[PDB]
Design a protein around this nucleic acid. Structure first.
Lengths: 333, 302, 305, 333
DNA sequence: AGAAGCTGCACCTTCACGGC
DNA sequence: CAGGTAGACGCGGACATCAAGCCCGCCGTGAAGGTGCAGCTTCT
């Protein structure tokens, strides 16, 4: 009857931080002696290019300000002039036990939820979901700004069985587009491995390494750190990059959001592209939140219409519901 | 509570000679008639609505985002143990020991040190503090005491070290010895090149000892009678006392000649007990040979 | 009576987003309660199948890198947050401040049970490691050693498995594997000692621990007073606000079969020793102490000095 | 329909930190292993050249004007004494998709802005903009003070396709002026290629080399580092030249400023030449900010008339607005 | 012509300076 | 298919002084809030 008041789901498909090395293309074979790109602090001089607030001011000080320069100090990460290839590497754990709630109050709700995800994995297992995850590992979507100017990108994925490699995949990440989800052989093999790691059987460890042909001496983008800038001069620098072990890298949540953006089923022009899987499905880029609960397509209403009122959604929306279950979250009333 | 009712708390914390008998205004008789000097019905009702809604609870709950953590009972079983954020104000003790009289003690510390007599009060520094602000731009939604401090929980650090602290914290020679032992284990016709390689390896070992004596000349001039003197009387003075901490010739055996033959002897005894292959015994004449070798290279310093 | 007969050494684990927030007064390294709860979860998931108990755990912290930043002009430091998605209509949500830190810590934990005579030599440790690879330590995903130049194995040493010279030899070969780290120790006798030397006709509220955390550079007829080791503040358990309630009493619990209680943090003093001056490695292990009808849901390192 | 509160535009035309080497003229073809220019820190004895302050106006302490060698510590970058040519080398990606912001709040404003940029680019493509960009790449305006006394300046632009050139241009940079955008067949080919890179119809990474005959052992001028540290002396250098790996270099934002000077449309006296494109178009070295908000010709009022009120400006102001969008930055309420 | 849930709007609300 | 044994490598004394170390301008902003009620809306 009533839903669980506390309903938690842990993050399956947990990635690690994506360290960035630099090296020449066709030297991707010996890509372990490659040095990492270090973030530098550089002071820049620019103008007052922001728009002014002409409220409780005077015109003389504002046009004297826009006549005067503006000194900042930002962080930047460059490739060397002897390396036209960025090597972004991370590990990925596919945990297992997908539909199991990590916290649930009602035992009847837990039993009905387990029976619902059991009937789902019985009639339609993790084929399409793992195919979309294998696409988003196969096309280099975790290069957010590092992909838009690349001539060629290549993704090498290695399954680490016990302490050594068991399976090697080598994909061209530009033939596999960012908006379409085709069907190939090696992608289906990677999806079957991801499904076996997601069916509760194993906890699969993969390494993903992406080579990107940017250019000699060009600028790469590690993920920017969030400082809220409410205090005494804590926003004078305006750009701080993420660095782990003296090396520029991308956050774990950014790689997770990058291989998570599989949802091509939302009620607002799904031919645009796949968006990230969120409850009340949100994109921070367009500043909109698709699947509002005024329409009957958010995660919450689909969830307690599936497991409570016994009415299954469409075949594409229960994929989104199970994708939130893999995505993990805190729900309940 | 709701921040919009916080106005009423600003009415209840009015220190008109006592705000404790005003918030929970129980010990008052004139204040009831002073809240409304018209009648006793609305005055008593407002008084009980002011003393009542600040001592009232409702229902026990933990709304799905407060933490709550299993604790293992000794035999078996668990408890759920929901933690709640305390209002311990170390923030007052932190702010008053960083701004109030930290300035006076700090100026006494920073312009009175040639004057040995400074002011009779000390201060702390509290390094590596961390600011945690709960309400982002409007901290009133959290609570009232989260508006006195503007967020800013002021967390003390823990921070495990990395092999360096001010309070307190804490192999090519083996390759040479191993290749010397593996070299004198086997024999190929026993010619000049074997003795050349033996002199080569013992030469590398003794210049490694010289490099160890030179790189430990970079520690300090003056050691002391620090313990462990069972092997530390002959090699005590081979690691030189830098000739600068002495300054009046307080040591008489620095140039007596006691150190070099004894250091060569005990070094060759170490090399005897360290290098002993299937040719088991090494012996005393080889000990005297390597002893006089290191002794010549140690008396070569002067 | 909680005495181990073995010591399963789990090697240098790397943890990518831990909880750098430890307590409402302390930040930095995570709580030892996290490590005791991790070992109790490992005993819940592994140890019942082998009929062994897993009680007590060490901490070495081979390296630490918090995700913080210095506000350019202040003497304190602020936390690098994460970005949450929009709420329901398209609007930047209210940020909660989560402190995250990269840890690298190896841990030795005390095996206790009858599920080892001589048959599980190094497959019991392989089982515990290959199951703990799919687990988190303080909110941080344990990165399970990707394809690199070297592996990093586990160890299982028995105290009865060897004579006295072999006992100290195995202690030495165990402490060579975690020597750059720093052992975390609960120090409560030192806190009470510094309190009762501090308490000379003046009271206290919590200054007994705050005075040992700080760096006072006071003057005595500037000088600076020294402390033995890194005496840090640590959250050492919980204390009871509420009488404990029945499982069907508190709305919105984690489950409706466990009794719930409302608790406050408790605060004690810890030290970061080096593990070559421990004098018995059968010490240095973090155990629970309930006394549950009083409160006092403590964790500690007993039998130390 | 109103302006979004967050509007971020990503840098198209991304250059690199331009490195400097030195060699001899007529060896320009085999100028690959040329030795790099290093930055030498020297100490100079000078005089008091600044005008005196009110504290040094005393009759006793005007001795500082009389005997004070003033003992400064500067940096310098010189050519070798048998090398009369400075070579400056960098790479330049041009990405495309100019009008799409990487961050927005109002999706209606985002769609209206994409509609205005789309009706621009199908009204008039990137012809004048890429023509002026190719002209600023043609004459070595990125050689800032390395151009004012050079005898002959020659630039070589190589369209690096995969690891080799695909089309090479070779321009006499002194014949092409710094104040008027003329026509040339190779310049129109380079402008068409930069326009094809600006419309997302191809991946364009160029390698730009520029040789200048400064003189035998003369002084070349790399970028001077900004040091954001206020009042202190007797140990401050006050001149720190920029260098990457002991090789003197020009900043990437300096090159980005220099190949952005395409604005010959501003309501003041335009007989001087092109200035850079900024909102409230500023030359802070000259101390004057053209396109003041007291005129209706800054970037923000023209943009909010073009997008919100549907008041399309003149075609030159349209070029200025799209040049600001190609530049990037923070716009919004 | 009466009941539930959603949205819009109002209501609350600023600091002390120099590395074991 | 081989290539040395022995022994020892100096003392003294000293290592400069004067005078000075610049001036100008500026330092982004956008978004990161909860609770309670009035009224509207949708449905029956």
């Amino acid at each position: 009857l009533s839903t669980a008041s506390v309903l938690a789901f842990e993050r399956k498909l947990d990635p690690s931080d994506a360290l960035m090395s630099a090296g020449a293309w066709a030297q991707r074979d010996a890509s372990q002696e490659w040095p990492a790109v270090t973030v530098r602090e550089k002071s820049v001089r620019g103008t007052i290019s922001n728009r002014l607030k002409t409220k409780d001011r005077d015109p003389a000080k504002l046009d004297a300000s826009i006549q005067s320069p503006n000194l900042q100090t930002v962080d930047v990460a460059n490739l060397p002039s002897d390396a036209d290839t960025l090597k972004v590497r991370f590990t990925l754990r596919v945990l297992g036990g997908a539909g199991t709630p990590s916290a649930c109050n009602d035992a009847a709700y837990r039993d009905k939820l387990l029976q619902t995800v059991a009937t789902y994995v019985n009639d339609q297992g993790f084929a399409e979901l793992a195919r979309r995850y294998a696409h988003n590992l196969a096309n280099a979507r975790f290069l957010w700004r590092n992909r838009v100017g690349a001539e060629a990108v290549e993704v090498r994925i290695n399954h680490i069985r016990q302490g050594e490699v068991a399976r090697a995949w080598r994909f061209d990440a530009l033939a596999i587009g960012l908006r379409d989800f085709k069907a190939d052989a090696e992608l289906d093999a990677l999806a079957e491995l991801i499904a076996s790691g997601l069916s509760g059987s194993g906890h699969v460890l993969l390494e993903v390494v992406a080579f990107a042909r940017i250019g000699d001496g060009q600028e790469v983008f590690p993920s920017q750190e969030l400082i809220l800038d409410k205090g005494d001069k804590k926003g004078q620098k305006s750009k701080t990059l993420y660095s782990v072990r003296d090396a520029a890298a991308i956050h774990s949540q950014k790689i997770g959001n990058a291989l998570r953006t599989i949802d091509t089923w939302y009620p607002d022009e799904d031919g645009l592209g796949p968006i990230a899987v969120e409850p009340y499905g949100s994109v921070t880029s367009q500043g909109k939140a698709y699947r509002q609960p005024k329409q009957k397509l958010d995660f919450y209403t689909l969830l307690d219409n599936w497991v409570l009122r016994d009415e299954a959604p469409a075949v594409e929306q229960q994929h989104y519901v199970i994708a939130n279950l893999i995505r993990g979250g805190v729900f309940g009333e | 509570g709701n921040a919009a009712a916080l106005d009423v708390f600003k009415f209840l914390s009015l220190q008109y000679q006592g705000k404790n008998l005003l918030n929970w205004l129980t010990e008052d008789s004139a204040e009831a008639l002073q809240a409304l000097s018209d009648n006793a019905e609305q005055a008593r009702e407002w008084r009980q609505a002011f003393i009542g809604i600040t001592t009232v609870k409702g229902a026990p709950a933990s709304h799905s985002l407060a933490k709550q953590l299993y604790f293992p009972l000794p035999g078996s079983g668990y408890h759920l143990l929901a933690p709640l954020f305390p209002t311990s104000l170390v923030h007052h003790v932190h702010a008053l020991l960083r701004e109030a009289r930290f300035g006076d003690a700090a100026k006494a510390a920073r312009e009175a040190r040639s004057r040995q007599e400074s002011w009779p009060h000390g201060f702390s520094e509290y390094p590596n503090l961390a600011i945690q602000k709960f309400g982002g731009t409007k901290p009133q939604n959290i609570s009232q005491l989260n508006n006195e401090r503007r967020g800013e929980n002021w967390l003390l650090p823990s921070l495990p070290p990395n092999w360096q602290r001010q309070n307190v914290n804490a192999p090519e020679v083996s390759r040479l010895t191993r290749t010397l032992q593996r070299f004198l284990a086997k024999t190929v016709h026993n010619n000049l090149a074997i003795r050349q390689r033996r002199a080569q390896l013992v030469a590398q070992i003794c210049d490694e000892a010289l490099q160890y004596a030179a790189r430990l000349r970079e520690l300090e001039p003056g050691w002391s009678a620090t313990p462990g003197c069972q092997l530390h009387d002959a090699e005590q003075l081979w690691l030189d006392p830098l000739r600068a901490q002495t300054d009046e010739t307080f040591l008489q055996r620095r140039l007596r000649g006691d150190w070099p033959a004894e250091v060569g002897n005990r070094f060759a005894n170490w090399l005897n007990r360290a290098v002993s292959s299937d040719s088991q015994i090494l012996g005393s004449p080889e000990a005297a040979q390597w002893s006089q070798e290191l002794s010549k290279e140690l008396t070569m310093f002067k | 009576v909680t005495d181990p007969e073995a010591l399963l050494l789990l090697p240098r684990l790397s943890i990518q987003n831990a909880n750098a927030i430890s307590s409402p007064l302390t930040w930095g390294f995570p709580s030892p309660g996290a490590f005791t709860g991790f070992v109790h979860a490992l005993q819940r998931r592994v140890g019942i199948s082998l009929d062994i108990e897993l009680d007590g755990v060490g901490i070495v912290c081979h390296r630490f890198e918090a995700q913080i930043s210095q506000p350019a002009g202040k003497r304190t430091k602020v936390f690098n947050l994460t970005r949450n998605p929009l709420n329901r209509d398209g609007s930047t949500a209210a940020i909660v401040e989560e402190g995250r830190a990269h840890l690298e810590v190896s841990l030795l934990l005390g095996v206790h049970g009858d599920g080892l005579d001589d048959h599980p030599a190094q497959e019991i440790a392989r089982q515990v490691q290959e199951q703990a690879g799919a687990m988190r330590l303080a909110g941080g995903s344990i990165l399970p050693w990707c394809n690199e130049r070297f592996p990093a194995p586990n160890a299982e040493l028995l105290m009865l498995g060897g004579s006295d010279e072999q006992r100290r030899k195995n202690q030495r070969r165990l402490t060579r594997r975690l020597l750059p780290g720093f052992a975390l120790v609960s120090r409560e006798a030192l806190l009470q000692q510094h309190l009762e030397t501090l308490r000379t006709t003046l009271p206290e509220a919590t200054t007994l621990d705050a005075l040992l955390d700080l760096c006072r550079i006071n003057f005595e007829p500037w000088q600076v007073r020294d402390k033995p080791g890194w005496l840090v503040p640590i959250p050492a358990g919980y204390n009871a606000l509420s009488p404990l309630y029945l499982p069907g009493e508190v709305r919105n619990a984690r489950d409706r079969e466990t009794p719930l209680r409302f608790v406050e943090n408790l605060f004690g003093l810890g030290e970061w020793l080096s593990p070559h001056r421990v004098a018995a490695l059968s010490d240095l292990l973090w155990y629970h102490h309930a006394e549950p009808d009083k409160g006092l849901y403590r964790w500690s390192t007993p039998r130390f000095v």
